[PDB]
mmCIF file of C-alpha atoms and ligand atoms in Angstrom:
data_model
loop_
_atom_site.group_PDB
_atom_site.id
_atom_site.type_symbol
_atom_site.label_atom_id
_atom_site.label_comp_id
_atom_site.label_asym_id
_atom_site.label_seq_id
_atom_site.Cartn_x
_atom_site.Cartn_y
_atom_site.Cartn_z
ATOM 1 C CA UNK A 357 35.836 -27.081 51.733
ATOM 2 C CA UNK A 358 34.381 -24.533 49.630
ATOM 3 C CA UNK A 359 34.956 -20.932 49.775
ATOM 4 C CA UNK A 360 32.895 -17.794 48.875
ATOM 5 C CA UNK A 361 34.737 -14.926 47.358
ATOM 6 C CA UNK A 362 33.960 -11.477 48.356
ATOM 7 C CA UNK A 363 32.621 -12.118 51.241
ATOM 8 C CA UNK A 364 34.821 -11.014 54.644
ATOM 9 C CA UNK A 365 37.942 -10.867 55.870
ATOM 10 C CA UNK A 366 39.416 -14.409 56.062
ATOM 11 C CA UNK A 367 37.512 -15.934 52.694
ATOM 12 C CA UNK A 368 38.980 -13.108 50.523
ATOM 13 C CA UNK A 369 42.703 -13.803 51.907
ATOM 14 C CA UNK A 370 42.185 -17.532 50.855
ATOM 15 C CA UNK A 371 40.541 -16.848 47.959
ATOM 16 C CA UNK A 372 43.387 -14.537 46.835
ATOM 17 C CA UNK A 373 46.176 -17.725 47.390
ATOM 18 C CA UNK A 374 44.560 -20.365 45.649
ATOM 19 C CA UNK A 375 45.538 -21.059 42.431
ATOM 20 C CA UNK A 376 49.383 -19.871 43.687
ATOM 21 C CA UNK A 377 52.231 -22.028 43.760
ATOM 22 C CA UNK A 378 53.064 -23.218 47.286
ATOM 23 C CA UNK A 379 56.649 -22.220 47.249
ATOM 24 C CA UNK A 380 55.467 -18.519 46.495
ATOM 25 C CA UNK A 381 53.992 -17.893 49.713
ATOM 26 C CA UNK A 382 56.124 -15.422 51.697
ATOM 27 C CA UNK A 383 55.590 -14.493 55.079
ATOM 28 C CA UNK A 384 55.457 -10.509 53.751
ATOM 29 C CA UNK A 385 52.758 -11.361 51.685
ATOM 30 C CA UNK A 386 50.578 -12.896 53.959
ATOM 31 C CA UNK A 387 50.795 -10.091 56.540
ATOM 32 C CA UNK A 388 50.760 -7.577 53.322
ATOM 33 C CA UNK A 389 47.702 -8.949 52.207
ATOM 34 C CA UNK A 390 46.379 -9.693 56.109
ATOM 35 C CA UNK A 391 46.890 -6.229 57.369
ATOM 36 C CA UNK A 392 44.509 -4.545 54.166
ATOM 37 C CA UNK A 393 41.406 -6.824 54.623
ATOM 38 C CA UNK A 394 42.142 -7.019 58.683
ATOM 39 C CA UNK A 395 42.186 -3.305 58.308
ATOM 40 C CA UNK A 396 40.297 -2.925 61.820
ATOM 41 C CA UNK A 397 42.790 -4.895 63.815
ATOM 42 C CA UNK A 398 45.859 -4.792 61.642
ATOM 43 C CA UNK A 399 47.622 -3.943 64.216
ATOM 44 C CA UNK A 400 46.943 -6.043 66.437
ATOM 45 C CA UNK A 401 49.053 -8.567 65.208
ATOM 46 C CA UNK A 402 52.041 -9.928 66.401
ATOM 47 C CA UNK A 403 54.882 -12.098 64.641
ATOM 48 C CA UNK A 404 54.150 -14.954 65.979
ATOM 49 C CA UNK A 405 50.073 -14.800 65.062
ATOM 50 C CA UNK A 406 51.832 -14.179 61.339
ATOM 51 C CA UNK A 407 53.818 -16.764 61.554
ATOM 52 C CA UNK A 408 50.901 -19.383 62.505
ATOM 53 C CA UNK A 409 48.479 -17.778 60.407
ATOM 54 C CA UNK A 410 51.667 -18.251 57.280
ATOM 55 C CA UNK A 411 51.877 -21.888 58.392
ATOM 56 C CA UNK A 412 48.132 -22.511 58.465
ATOM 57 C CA UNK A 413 47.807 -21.032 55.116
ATOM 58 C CA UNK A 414 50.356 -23.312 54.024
ATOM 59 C CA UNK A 415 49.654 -26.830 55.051
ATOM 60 C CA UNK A 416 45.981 -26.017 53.738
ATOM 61 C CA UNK A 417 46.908 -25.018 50.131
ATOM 62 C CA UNK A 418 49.051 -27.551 49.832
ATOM 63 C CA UNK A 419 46.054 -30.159 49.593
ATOM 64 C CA UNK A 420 44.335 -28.753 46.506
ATOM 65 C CA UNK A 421 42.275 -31.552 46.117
ATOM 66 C CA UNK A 422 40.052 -30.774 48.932
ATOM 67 C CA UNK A 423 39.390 -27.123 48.171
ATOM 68 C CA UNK A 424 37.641 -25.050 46.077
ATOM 69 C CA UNK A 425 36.571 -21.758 45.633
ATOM 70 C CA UNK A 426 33.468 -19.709 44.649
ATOM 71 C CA UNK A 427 34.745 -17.364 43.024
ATOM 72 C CA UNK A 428 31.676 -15.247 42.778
ATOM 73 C CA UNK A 429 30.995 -15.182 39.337
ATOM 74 C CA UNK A 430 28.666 -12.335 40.093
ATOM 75 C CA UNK A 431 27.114 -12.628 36.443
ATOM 76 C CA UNK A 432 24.232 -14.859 37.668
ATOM 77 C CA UNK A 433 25.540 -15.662 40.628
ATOM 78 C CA UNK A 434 23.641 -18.763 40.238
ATOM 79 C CA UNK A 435 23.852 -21.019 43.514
ATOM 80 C CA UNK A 436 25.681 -22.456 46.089
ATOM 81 C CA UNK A 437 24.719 -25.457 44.220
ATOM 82 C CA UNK A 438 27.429 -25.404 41.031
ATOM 83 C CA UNK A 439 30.257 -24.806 43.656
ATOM 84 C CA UNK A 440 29.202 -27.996 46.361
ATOM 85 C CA UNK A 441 28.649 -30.221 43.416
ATOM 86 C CA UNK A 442 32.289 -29.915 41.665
ATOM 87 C CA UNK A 443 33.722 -29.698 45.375
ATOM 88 C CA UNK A 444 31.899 -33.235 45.902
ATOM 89 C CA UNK A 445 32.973 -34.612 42.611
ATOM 90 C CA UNK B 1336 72.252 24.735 30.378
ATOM 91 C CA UNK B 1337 70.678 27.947 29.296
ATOM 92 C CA UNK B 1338 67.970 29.791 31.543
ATOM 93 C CA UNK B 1339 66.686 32.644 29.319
ATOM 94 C CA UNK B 1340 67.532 35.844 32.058
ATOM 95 C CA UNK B 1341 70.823 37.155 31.831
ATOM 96 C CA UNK B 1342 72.164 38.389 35.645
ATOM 97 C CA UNK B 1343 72.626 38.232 39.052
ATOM 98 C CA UNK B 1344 68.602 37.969 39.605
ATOM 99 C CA UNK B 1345 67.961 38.329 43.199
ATOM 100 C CA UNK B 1346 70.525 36.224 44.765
ATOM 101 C CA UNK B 1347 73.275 37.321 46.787
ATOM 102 C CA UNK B 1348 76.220 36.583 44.483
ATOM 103 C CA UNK B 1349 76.959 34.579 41.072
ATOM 104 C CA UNK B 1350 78.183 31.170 40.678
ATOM 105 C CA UNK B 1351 76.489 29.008 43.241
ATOM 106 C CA UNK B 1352 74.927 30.643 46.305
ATOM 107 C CA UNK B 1353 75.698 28.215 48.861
ATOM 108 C CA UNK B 1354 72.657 27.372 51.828
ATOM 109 C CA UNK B 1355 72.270 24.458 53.969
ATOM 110 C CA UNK B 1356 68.811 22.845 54.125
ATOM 111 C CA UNK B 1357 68.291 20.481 57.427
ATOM 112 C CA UNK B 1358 65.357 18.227 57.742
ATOM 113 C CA UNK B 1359 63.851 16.605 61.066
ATOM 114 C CA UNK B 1360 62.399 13.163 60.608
ATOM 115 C CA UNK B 1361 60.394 11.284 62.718
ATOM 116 C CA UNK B 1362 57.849 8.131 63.099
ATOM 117 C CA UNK B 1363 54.415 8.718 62.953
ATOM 118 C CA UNK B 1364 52.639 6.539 65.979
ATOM 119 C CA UNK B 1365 48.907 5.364 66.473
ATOM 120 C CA UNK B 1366 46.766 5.538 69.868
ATOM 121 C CA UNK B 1367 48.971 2.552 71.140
ATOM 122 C CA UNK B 1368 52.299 3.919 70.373
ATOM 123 C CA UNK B 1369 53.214 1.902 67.182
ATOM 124 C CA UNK B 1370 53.852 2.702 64.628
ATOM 125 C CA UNK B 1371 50.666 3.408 62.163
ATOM 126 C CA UNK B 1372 50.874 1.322 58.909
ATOM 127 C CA UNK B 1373 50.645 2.307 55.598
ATOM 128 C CA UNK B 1374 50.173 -0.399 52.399
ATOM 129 C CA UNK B 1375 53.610 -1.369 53.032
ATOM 130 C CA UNK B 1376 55.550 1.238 54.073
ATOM 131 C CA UNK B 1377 55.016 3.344 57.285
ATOM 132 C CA UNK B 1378 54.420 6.999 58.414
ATOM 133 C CA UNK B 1379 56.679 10.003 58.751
ATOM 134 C CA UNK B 1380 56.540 13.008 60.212
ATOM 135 C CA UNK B 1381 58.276 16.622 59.475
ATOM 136 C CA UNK B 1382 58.564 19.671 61.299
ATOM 137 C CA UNK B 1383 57.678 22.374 59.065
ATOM 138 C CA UNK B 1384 57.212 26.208 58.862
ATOM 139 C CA UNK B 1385 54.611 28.545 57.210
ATOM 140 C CA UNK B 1386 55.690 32.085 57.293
ATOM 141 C CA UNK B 1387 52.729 34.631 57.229
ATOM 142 C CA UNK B 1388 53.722 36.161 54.046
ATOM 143 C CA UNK B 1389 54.635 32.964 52.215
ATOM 144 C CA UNK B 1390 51.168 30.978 52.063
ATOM 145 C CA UNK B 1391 53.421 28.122 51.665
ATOM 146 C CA UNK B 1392 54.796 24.995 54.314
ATOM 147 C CA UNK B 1393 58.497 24.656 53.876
ATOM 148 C CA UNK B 1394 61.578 23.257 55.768
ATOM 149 C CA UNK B 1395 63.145 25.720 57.849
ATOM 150 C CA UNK B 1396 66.710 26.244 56.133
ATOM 151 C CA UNK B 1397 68.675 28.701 55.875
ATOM 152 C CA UNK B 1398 71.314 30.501 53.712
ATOM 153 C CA UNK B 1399 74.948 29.244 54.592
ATOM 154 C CA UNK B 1400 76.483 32.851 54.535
ATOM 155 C CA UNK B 1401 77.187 32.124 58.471
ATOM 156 C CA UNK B 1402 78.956 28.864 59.660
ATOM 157 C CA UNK B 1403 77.086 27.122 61.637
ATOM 158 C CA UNK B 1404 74.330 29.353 62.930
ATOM 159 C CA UNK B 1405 73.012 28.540 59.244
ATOM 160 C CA UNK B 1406 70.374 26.451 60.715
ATOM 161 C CA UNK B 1407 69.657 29.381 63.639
ATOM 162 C CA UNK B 1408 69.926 31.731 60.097
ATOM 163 C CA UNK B 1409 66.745 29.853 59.499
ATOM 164 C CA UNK B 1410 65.822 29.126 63.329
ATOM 165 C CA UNK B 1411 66.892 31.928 65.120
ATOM 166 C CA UNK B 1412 63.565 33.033 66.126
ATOM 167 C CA UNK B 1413 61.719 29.683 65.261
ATOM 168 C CA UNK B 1414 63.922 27.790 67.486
ATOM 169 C CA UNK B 1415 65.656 29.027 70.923
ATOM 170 C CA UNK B 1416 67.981 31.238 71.250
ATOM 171 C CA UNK B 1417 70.838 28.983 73.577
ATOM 172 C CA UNK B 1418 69.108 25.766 73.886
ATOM 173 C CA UNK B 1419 69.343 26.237 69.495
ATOM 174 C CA UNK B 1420 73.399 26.354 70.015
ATOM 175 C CA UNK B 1421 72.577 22.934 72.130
ATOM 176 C CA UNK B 1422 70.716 21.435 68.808
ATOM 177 C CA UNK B 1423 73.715 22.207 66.492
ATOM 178 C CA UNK B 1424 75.714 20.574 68.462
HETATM 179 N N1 APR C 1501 62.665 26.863 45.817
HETATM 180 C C1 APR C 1501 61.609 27.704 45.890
HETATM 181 N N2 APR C 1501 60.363 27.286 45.608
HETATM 182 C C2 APR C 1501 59.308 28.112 45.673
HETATM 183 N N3 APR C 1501 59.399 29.399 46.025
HETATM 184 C C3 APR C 1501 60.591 29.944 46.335
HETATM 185 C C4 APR C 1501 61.793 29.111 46.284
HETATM 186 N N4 APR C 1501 62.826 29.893 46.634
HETATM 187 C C5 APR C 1501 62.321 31.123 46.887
HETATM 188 N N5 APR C 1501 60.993 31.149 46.709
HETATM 189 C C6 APR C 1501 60.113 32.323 46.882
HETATM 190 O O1 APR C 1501 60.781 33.502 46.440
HETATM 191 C C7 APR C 1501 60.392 34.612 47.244
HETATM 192 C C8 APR C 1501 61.603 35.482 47.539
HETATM 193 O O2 APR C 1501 62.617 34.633 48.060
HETATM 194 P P1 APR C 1501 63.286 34.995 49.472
HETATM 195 O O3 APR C 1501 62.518 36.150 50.055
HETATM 196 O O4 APR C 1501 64.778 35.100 49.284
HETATM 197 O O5 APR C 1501 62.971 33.631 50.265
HETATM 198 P P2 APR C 1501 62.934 33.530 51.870
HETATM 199 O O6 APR C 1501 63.911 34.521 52.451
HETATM 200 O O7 APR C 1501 63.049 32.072 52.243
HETATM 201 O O8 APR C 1501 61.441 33.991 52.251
HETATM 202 C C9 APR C 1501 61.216 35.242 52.888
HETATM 203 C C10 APR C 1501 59.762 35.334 53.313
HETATM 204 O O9 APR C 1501 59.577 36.488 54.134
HETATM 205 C C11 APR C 1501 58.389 37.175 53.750
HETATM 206 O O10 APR C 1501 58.585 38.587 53.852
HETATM 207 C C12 APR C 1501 58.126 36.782 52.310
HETATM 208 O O11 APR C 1501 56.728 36.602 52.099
HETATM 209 C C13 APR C 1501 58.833 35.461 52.121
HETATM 210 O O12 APR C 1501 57.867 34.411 52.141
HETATM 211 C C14 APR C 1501 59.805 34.040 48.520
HETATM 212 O O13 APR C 1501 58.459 34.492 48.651
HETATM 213 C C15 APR C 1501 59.792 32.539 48.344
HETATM 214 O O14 APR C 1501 58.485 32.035 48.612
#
């Protein structure tokens, strides 16, 4: 899975956690950084959406093998193509 | 330390001129009735005065030259008259 970085709400918040340690998520952080770019509907959430949303995040960046990011480099901002080829490889 | 005005100035006596300042706190809610967000923190409110002589917002408190009518010293006339000996209890 490849993601694009600034694009929208839920691409930026995994974009922000990728190359972090997976012991270093905290449950503050994720609804710290959720409730900024969910700025619309912050609060609408409830502890137990934070909670799932904290576990989600989890379980998928502990596989770091199967995920990469953009990063939009923004400089040339050359192609989807660089990013799907060294996410295949 | 050292001021630079030798005197009583326009205070009542020397030394220390003893006043009580009270503040009212409260939270700040949104349409729903939580309460609104900031980056981390959250909001709070103040009840505050602006006399029409002062051009200024301040917190209504008063010189501590009475005992406990300090407060009505500053809220006499801003706050009630028996309902205010109700408050400072
Ligand atoms: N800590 C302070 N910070 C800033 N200004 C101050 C402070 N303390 C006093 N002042 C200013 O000094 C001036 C004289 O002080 P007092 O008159 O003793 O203060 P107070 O009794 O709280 O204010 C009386 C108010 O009634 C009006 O007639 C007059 O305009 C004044 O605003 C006031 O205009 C007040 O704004």
């Amino acid at each position: 899975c490849v993601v694009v970085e600034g694009s929208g709400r839920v691409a930026d918040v995994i974009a922000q956690v990728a190359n972090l340690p997976v012991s270093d998520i905290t449950i503050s952080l994720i609804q710290q950084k959720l409730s900024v770019f969910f700025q619309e509907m912050f609060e609408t959430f409830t502890e137990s959406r934070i909670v799932e949303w904290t576990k989600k995040i989890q379980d998928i960046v502990r596989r770091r093998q199967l995920l990469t990011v953009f990063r939009e480099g923004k400089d040339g901002q050359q192609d989807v193509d660089v990013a799907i080829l060294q996410a295949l490889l | 330390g050292r001021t630079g005005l030798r005197g009583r100035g326009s205070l009542s006596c020397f030394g220390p001129n003893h006043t009580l300042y009270p503040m009212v706190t409260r939270w700040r809610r949104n349409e729903d009735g939580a309460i609104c967000r900031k980056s981390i923190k959250k909001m709070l409110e103040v009840l505050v005065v602006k006399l029409p002589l002062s051009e200024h917002w301040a917190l209504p408190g008063g010189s501590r030259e009475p005992g406990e009518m300090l407060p009505r010293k500053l809220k006499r006339i801003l706050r009630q008259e028996h309902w205010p000996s109700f408050e400072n209890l």
